[PDB]
Amino acid sequence: AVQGLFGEYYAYAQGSDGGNLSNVAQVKAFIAANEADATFIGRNIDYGSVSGDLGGNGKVQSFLKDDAGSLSTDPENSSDAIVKLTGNLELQAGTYQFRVRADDGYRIEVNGQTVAEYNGNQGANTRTGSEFTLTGDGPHSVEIVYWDQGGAAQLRIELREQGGAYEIFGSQHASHG
Numbered sequence: 001a002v003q004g005l006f007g008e009y010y011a012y013a014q015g016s017d018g019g020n021l022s023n024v025a026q027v028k029a030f031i032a033a034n035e036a037d038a039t040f041i042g043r044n045i046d047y048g049s050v051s052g053d054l055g056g057n058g059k060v061q062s063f064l065k066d067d068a069g070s071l072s073t074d075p076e077n078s079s080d081a082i083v084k085l086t087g088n089l090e091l092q093a094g095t096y097q098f099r100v101r102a103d104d105g106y107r108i109e110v111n112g113q114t115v116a117e118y119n120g121n122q123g124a125n126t127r128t129g130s131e132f133t134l135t136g137d138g139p140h141s142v143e144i145v146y147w148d149q150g151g152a153a154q155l156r157i158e159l160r161e162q163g164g165a166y167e168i169f170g171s172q173h174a175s176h177g
């Protein structure tokens, strides 16, 4: 098992690939029908802010900060961009909660259930997700989708245990195979 989350980056070209990115179902549909343009490992999910489009030349590299060194290639540039992060939560039984600052939207699912989302376009804003209690014996899957419709782009995910303090989400909390 590898520490951190498995990262996938998708270039989306408004026009040829369809309309502006603006909702989770649309983003998920593009992901499901396409192979990622680059992969990476998300060890510390504190990315951006960058301006001039996440899909702009050199921009995903700047956005990913120290995680850029794990990109499999320099993906093609585009108007819009999608990131997916997947792994298993390396957590004992408990009740946890995400807080996310993002531009634009995102959805976090744990064991297939939505636990945080901003289903739309927005300037960078911070939103607290719902408390969730791990259910079943696991592994406890986590799946994050995120997009930039254009302009500025930021994604910072924090995780806490109920009654505790937020920590930047990453290798401390998740692994993948």
Ligand SMILES: OC[C@H]1O[C@@H](O)[C@H](O)[C@@H](O)[C@@H]1O
Pocket: 103, 104, 121, 122, 123, 124, 149, 150, 151, 152, 153
């Ligand atoms: O239009 C609302 C917001 O949309 C975001 O996608 C842009 O990155 C912001 O710069 C803009 O303020």
Ligand SMILES: [Ca+2]
Pocket: 056, 057, 058, 059, 074, 075, 076, 077
């Ligand atoms: Ca590029």
Ligand SMILES: [Ca+2]
Pocket: 014, 020, 021, 079, 080, 148, 149, 150
């Ligand atoms: Ca767009």
Ligand SMILES: [Ca+2]
Pocket: 103, 104, 122, 148, 149, 150, 151, 152, 153
């Ligand atoms: Ca944006």
Ligand code: NA
Pocket: 011
């Ligand atoms: Na493409």
